[model samples]
Target: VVGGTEAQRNSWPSQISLQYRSGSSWAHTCGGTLIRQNWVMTAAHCVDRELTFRVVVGEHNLNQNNGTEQYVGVQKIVVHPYWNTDDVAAGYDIALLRLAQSVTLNSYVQLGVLPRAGTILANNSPCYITGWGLTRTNGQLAQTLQQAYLPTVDYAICSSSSYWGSTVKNSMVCAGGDGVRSGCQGDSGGPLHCLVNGQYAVHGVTSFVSRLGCNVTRKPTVFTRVSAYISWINNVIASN
Candidate 1:
């Protein structure tokens, strides 16, 4: 059972997944964000490798089914053209999956907006990050949607000469990790949410970095800034 302070319905935002059937079991490939009644955002890598896929949204548990995995059949998958697979630092890793049918909005699920770039997010702003990701290198995927606080990394300090990566793109922002407290192997493509106007908004999508060594100052956990892709998102949404 979830903590008394937390409501079961609110768990859906962090519990969605891109699942594929394998024999009698389904394995999760990547993560997704419920952006609209029928829209979910995930990484292109997930779709690039899939011919047919089902997005399971509005569920608390992935490994088990205390609730339902609202299976939204995929209509079309879109990826950014400039997504650099070669240069991981170029970091334009984002994608969108349109559902065949729209969902009914409920306490378990809700949509959110993106934040404008250059808006400084203060440290310890009470932002949330979730995933079915492993707790460590050898850990298993969490059954329930795991939640953790996302501490902001100072971009100035993050981009300094001592940083591991040579160049930090303007489109990228910095976030913290503590091997156990941050997103690991399986969390990729999940949303990094920032609460604005008493509502949650998708600020970033869990991208990748070279290492998983948590809370290291030089190497920050990277994500695709959703604000930078708003225009492209609009275009895709309009076409779909």
Candidate 2:
């Protein structure tokens, strides 16, 4: 994330690195959340390519072993049926992946708590975007996880002409339009952690940023509103 700080270990237990096989090696492509012991939530665009994928839990530094990492192959992938690759701005960018085996729960790895269906935060609600994305626009991905405080921008304001205009939808959450701190490349599909009742929950799925740049004023990082698709998530898991 641009203008983010190095995240402390154990700060986000559900955070994971979604990697793709590259010439006998694995490379981090997007960030994801562990929604269940053998399920991960991410953006559909992250798995658009026909490449082998894996999920890494309990990871802190990408270049370090960390000793707590749990690597698992993806057995199945289910992208939102309505998702359109040619038109990501139309929404439905979410997806789910079934792991080959269930991962063990611990301090370094756990299920991501999701927001109740139809839940919406107030304007400027406290939230953070965490991932191993680039530290700056046009910059290299960080070796370690990073987090940026990105307060929610209410739909009324975010959809205004000065901001994202009609491009921002109610099915999406916009945050960190300050052009100082925001999610950048390689951060897509990560969770937007919002504190509610003193407990954190996964409120959003990192989807897109401004086409102009990663960090831009009036064009906050956009996310797939998780609450809007609670039933879809449940259906995918139940039938899979």
Candidate 3:
């Protein structure tokens, strides 16, 4: 994330690195949250490329070998049925990845808690975006996971013409329009942790940033509103 600090190792235990095979090596493509021992929540766009993918739980660094990490192949991918690659602004950009084998839960790897269905944050609610995404618009991914404080911009304000306008929908959340701190390339499908009742909950799945730039005034980072899809998530998990 742009203009952020290194996240403490295991602080956000549910955070994960979604990577794909690139030749002989694996490369980070997006971020995800562990919702179950074998299920991960990510943005549908992240797996749209159709490459060989794997997930690493308890990953704090992209290059460092942290003994706490667990590597597992993706057993199945279920993208939202209505998600359209051509129209991300129309919403429905979420996905779930079923791990081939369930990983053990530990201090460094745990399940992400989701907010109650229909929950909505007030304007400017405190939140943070975490991921291995770039530190700048044209920068490379961070060596260590980074986190930036990104306050929520309620739907009404976010959909204003001066901000994200028509592109921002009620099914999405907008944060960090300060144009300094925001989600950048490679941060997609990550968690937007919001503090609610003294506990952090995974409320968003990083969806898109402004086309003009990653950090642009009035164009905050957009995310697929997780609360809006709790039923869909449960259905996918139950039926599969």
Score every model by TM-score.
0.85, 0.99, 0.99
The models' CA-based lDDT, in order, is: 0.67, 0.96, 0.96
Candidate 1 clashes between residue pairs 3 or more apart in a chain or in different chains: 9-108, 177-215
lDDT at 185, model 1: 60
Clashing pairs in 3: none
lDDT of 1 at 110: 65
Q: Could you give candidate 3's per-residue lDDT for residues 1-240 as a string of tens digits?
A: 999999999789999999999999999999999999999999999999979999999899889888889999999999999999999999999999999999999999999999999999999999999999999999999999999999999999999999988889999999999979999999999999999999999999999998889999999999999999999999999999
lDDT, candidate 1, 97-157, per-residue tens: 8889987766666675667644556654555667777655555666777766665565565
Regions of model 3 farther than 4 Å from truth: none
| Candidate 2 C-alpha lDDT tens digits along 23-81 | 97999999999999999999999999999999999999999889999999999999999
- The global Cα lDDT (0 to 1) of model 1 is 0.67
The lDDT, on a scale of 0 to 1, for candidate 3 is 0.96
- Report how far off residue 199 is in candidate 1 (Å): 3.5
